[PDB]
Amino acid sequence: NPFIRFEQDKKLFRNALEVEGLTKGFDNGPLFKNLNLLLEVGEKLAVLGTNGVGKSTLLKTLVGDLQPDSGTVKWSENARIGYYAQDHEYEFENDLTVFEWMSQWKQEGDDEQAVRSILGRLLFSQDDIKKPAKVLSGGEKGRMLFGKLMMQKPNILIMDQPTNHLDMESIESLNMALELYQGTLIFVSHDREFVSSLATRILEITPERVIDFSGNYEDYLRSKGIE
Amino acid sequence: MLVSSNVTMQFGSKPLFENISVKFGGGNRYGLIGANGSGKSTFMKILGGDLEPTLGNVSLDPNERIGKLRQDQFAFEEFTVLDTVIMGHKELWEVKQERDRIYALPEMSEEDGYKVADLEVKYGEMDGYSAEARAGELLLGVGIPVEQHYGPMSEVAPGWKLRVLLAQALFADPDILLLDQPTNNLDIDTIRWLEQVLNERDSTMIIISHDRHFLNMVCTHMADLDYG
Amino acid sequence: KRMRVIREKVDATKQYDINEAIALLKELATAKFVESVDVAVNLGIDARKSDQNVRGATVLPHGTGRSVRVAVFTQGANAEAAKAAGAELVGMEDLADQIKKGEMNFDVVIASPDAMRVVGQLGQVLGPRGLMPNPKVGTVTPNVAEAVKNAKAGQVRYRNDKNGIIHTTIGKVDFDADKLKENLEALLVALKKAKPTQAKGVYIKKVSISTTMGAGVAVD
RNA sequence: UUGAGCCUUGAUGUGUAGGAUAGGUGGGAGGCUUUGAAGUGUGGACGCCAGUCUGCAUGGAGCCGACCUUGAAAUACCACC
Numbered sequence: 001n002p003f004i005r006f007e008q009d010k011k012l013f014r015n016a017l018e019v020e021g022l023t024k025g026f027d028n029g030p031l032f033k034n035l036n037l038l039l040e041v042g043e044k045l046a047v048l049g050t051n052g053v054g055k056s057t058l059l060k061t062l063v064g065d066l067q068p069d070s071g072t073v074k075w076s077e078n079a080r081i082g083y084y085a086q087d088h089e090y091e092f093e094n095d096l097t098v099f100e101w102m103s104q105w106k107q108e109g110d111d112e113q114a115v116r117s118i119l120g121r122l123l124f125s126q127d128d129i130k131k132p133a134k135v136l137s138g139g140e141k142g143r144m145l146f147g148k149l150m151m152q153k154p155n156i157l158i159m160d161q162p163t164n165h166l167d168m169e170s171i172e173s174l175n176m177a178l179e180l181y182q183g184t185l186i187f188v189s190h191d192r193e194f195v196s197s198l199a200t201r202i203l204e205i206t207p208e209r210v211i212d213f214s215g216n217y218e219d220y221l222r223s224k225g226i227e
Numbered sequence: 228m229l230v231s232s233n234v235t236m237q238f239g240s241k242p243l244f245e246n247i248s249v250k251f252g253g254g255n256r257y258g259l260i261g262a263n264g265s266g267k268s269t270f271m272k273i274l275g276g277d278l279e280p281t282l283g284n285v286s287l288d289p290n291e292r293i294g295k296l297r298q299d300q301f302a303f304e305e306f307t308v309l310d311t312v313i314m315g316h317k318e319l320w321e322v323k324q325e326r327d328r329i330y331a332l333p334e335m336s337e338e339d340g341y342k343v344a345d346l347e348v349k350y351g352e353m354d355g356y357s358a359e360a361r362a363g364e365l366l367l368g369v370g371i372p373v374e375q376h377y378g379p380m381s382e383v384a385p386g387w388k389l390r391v392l393l394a395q396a397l398f399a400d401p402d403i404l405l406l407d408q409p410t411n412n413l414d415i416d417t418i419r420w421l422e423q424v425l426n427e428r429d430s431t432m433i434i435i436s437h438d439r440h441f442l443n444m445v446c447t448h449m450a451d452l453d454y455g
Numbered sequence: 456k457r458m459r460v461i462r463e464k465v466d467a468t469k470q471y472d473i474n475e476a477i478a479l480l481k482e483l484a485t486a487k488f489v490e491s492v493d494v495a496v497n498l499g500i501d502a503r504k505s506d507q508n509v510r511g512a513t514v515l516p517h518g519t520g521r522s523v524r525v526a527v528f529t530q531g532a533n534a535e536a537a538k539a540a541g542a543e544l545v546g547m548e549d550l551a552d553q554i555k556k557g558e559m560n561f562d563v564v565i566a567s568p569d570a571m572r573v574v575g576q577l578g579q580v581l582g583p584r585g586l587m588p589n590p591k592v593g594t595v596t597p598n599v600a601e602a603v604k605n606a607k608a609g610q611v612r613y614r615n616d617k618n619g620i621i622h623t624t625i626g627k628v629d630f631d632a633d634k635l636k637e638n639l640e641a642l643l644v645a646l647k648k649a650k651p652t653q654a655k656g657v658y659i660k661k662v663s664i665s666t667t668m669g670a671g672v673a674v675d
Numbered sequence: 676u677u678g679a680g681c682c683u684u685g686a687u688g689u690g691u692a693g694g695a696u697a698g699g700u701g702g703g704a705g706g707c708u709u710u711g712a713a714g715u716g717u718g719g720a721c722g723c724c725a726g727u728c729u730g731c732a733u734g735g736a737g738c739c740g741a742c743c744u745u746g747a748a749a750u751a752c753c754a755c756c
């Protein structure tokens with residue numbers, strides 16, 4: 001059972017995000033129509049909706065790598081964003097040793113004694129820290145990105161499907177790691193258990209119109225009419 | 228039926244798995260479970276022959292068409308979706324494309340004509356005439372539109388071509404299915420369709436899955452890969 | 456109805472005699488038709504494996520009792536050779552590309568090794584229905600004149616069912632028992648000589664002769 | 676009473692693009708119905724729920740392949756499965 005826990009270096013107050021008129025589409029036009037929202041601090045926003053629709057590309061626009069058609073996204077002043085992309089190959093195509101790859105993100109005020117502690121908690125013991133970063137398992141890679149988020153210590157976590165290639169032990173450790181998190185969280189998942197365990201607001205998009213909520217997934221289903 | 232004897236793969240200075248010897252076969256479905264980094268993908272590579280073991284054997288019958296899954300490649304990207312799912316049948320694909328090449332090159336001489344007649348009868352026996360139709364009746368199940376069935380592999384979306392790569396594996400009822408994490412980044416409806424279409428088949432299937440509700444749904448045996 | 460009044464009269468369990476089965480079929484010939492008789496044998500082979508496939512064609516000692524226009528598929532001298540053999544088709548590159556492009560088919564196909572206009576033009580029509588000639592089946596013959604006698608002389612082809620059954624027409628209820636017995640024997644001998652190398656078990660399990668509108672019975 | 680094997684008889688095995696819930700061989704395509712109809716008057720079973728199978732008849736004596744879109748044709752039917 002890996003020991004994962006995200007902390008927050010500089011807590012930020014009042015609104016953490018605001019999105020004003022974020023219409024965008026690639027070639028179907030209204031991928032999401034006239035989005036308008038304001039995300040407070042401590043929100044755990046689970047963005048649902050399932051398939052081919054802009055379930056992602058919302059996160060990509062929020063981080064900025066996918067320019068929107070119209071609209072402006074105003075992050076908080078000190079907002080530091082930890083991004084866990086759904087497709088994360090580009091950060092491992094470069095072939096560094098696991099130790100160097102985890103050491104890229106060491107911050108001001110920590111050693112390579114403290115660098116290796118994250119890998120130790122992530123169960124990379126003595127030889128699995130000598131492998132090329134390219135040759136690693138899918139779960140052993142998702143964990144290695146979790147250990148980069150932990151190392152950067154963000155105050156806004158955006159995670160595109162953080163439950164990929166992770167066994168029961170990992171989706172039981174990270175679930176409570178994010179539950180103890182004190183900060184802004186934006187995530188997307190399909191399994192009706194991980195999203196239901198930790199969520200205070202649901203924003204799911206349907207290929208005609210977004211629908212927003214203000215409660216957890218159980219109340220969401222009862223209001224939808226699902227037994 | 229597939230057998231493996233003393234596979235013993237090792238790169239480093241710690242045992243990975245030792246003297247693995249097991250008979251896979253009989254129509255049973257073996258969910259292969261384990262931790263996040265133990266042996267599963269490098270074991271379904273060995274069972275398909277992608278990499279030979281450090282010292283061991285894998286035995287298969289002279290003709291047993293292994294239907295295995297991707298997610299070690301993404302970039303075929305040279306041809307249409309129909310003829311992309313078709314080439315899951317590595318036997319039929321070669322005869323089809325070779326006879327197309329022969330038709331392209333002039334002329335059908337006596338070497339060419341006698342080289343082609345037997346390939347044509349082989350194609351008929353392999354029922355390539357109704358190959359594209361049965362491929363399309365599966366692409367519709369996966370969720371790809373009929374009007375763009377014939378589009379090339381660049382027309383498809385990056386998040387939509389893993390659907391085609393999944394449909395390739397289970398093309399025409401191939402015995403021994405090597406499924407490596409098939410349900411990842413798939414939806415509830417597609418998962419239900421897949422677990423329904425795998426429930427109507429008599430073909431041993433070794434499946435990697437880290438979830439419980441799919442293994443507990445389809446699988447019969449629960450092969451583990453822990454402790455070595 | 457007739458199928459309700461003959462089902463009791465004929466039983467499929469009792470493997471009737473070689474002459475008794477034919478006699479019973481002749482007695483039961485009632486439908487107002489020429490009523491071609493057919494024969495179905497159950498070879499013992501594994502159709503899942505290609506090397507145990509039995510593709511063949513032989514000239515029956517009497518004939519099928521029907522005439523089919525053996526369309527010649529050839530070009531050049533080889534295609535023109537069949538014109539003097541008395542065939543019901545004309546072989547040309549255009550005549551197979553345009554004339555044979557929309558044409559359904561002939562009764563059978565001759566083989567031409569010189570011309571090539573009727574090779575890729577068939578496609579779903581020339582191969583999907585099983586009319587394409589192959590060297591083993593004798594359709595792709597070196598000589599159009601040879602194919603004329605191999606098809607117009609009373610030659611019958613056969614390919615396995617997906618479960619390993621060979622059935623084909625043998626004659627008509629007008630034909631006599633003395634002709635039909637040798638007609639069946641020739642086909643049985645042909646299959647016996649055409650048995651593949653790896654044929655486990657007995658390769659002739661059941662032999663049922665039947666009419667179009669009648670039932671069938673085992674003969675051996 | 677309940678397992679299993681075997682035999683005999685009957686059903687079930689649409690996604691398009693089709694009239695319509697066509698299994699592959701191919702025998703034929705003009706054959707099925709009056710030892711008493713397609714529809715009707717009315718039962719049950721099955722289902723991707725659109726549609727199929729079956730008792731008997733006051734009356735009952737007429738339905739489909741030919742066309743046609745498909746890689747492929749038809750409960751016109753019998754065949755070996």
Ligand SMILES: Nc1ncnc2c1ncn2[C@@H]1O[C@H](COP(=O)(O)OP(=O)(O)OP(=O)(O)O)[C@@H](O)[C@H]1O
Pocket residue numbers: 026050051052053054055056057384386387412
């Ligand atoms: N890089 C791209 N180039 C072109 N079109 C794209 C690109 N990325 C996405 N699209 C298009 O925009 C659509 C939105 O895809 P999106 O990432 O929102 O899907 P998703 O719901 O996250 O999918 P999945 O769960 O299958 O990963 C895609 O289906 C595709 O049509």
Ligand SMILES: Nc1ncnc2c1ncn2[C@@H]1O[C@H](COP(=O)(O)OP(=O)(O)OP(=O)(O)O)[C@@H](O)[C@H]1O
Pocket residue numbers: 131135136137138139140165238261262263264265266267268269270407408435
């Ligand atoms: N070239 C290599 N060098 C060193 N170690 C390697 C190499 N290739 C693979 N490995 C190791 O082999 C193991 C493979 O693990 P495996 O792929 O079975 O994990 P998984 O996440 O359970 O699988 P899956 O992706 O199939 O769900 C890992 O421990 C990985 O580090």
Ligand code: NA
Pocket residue numbers: 055056057086386
């Ligand atoms: Na996505």
Ligand code: NA
Pocket residue numbers: 137138268269
């Ligand atoms: Na892997």
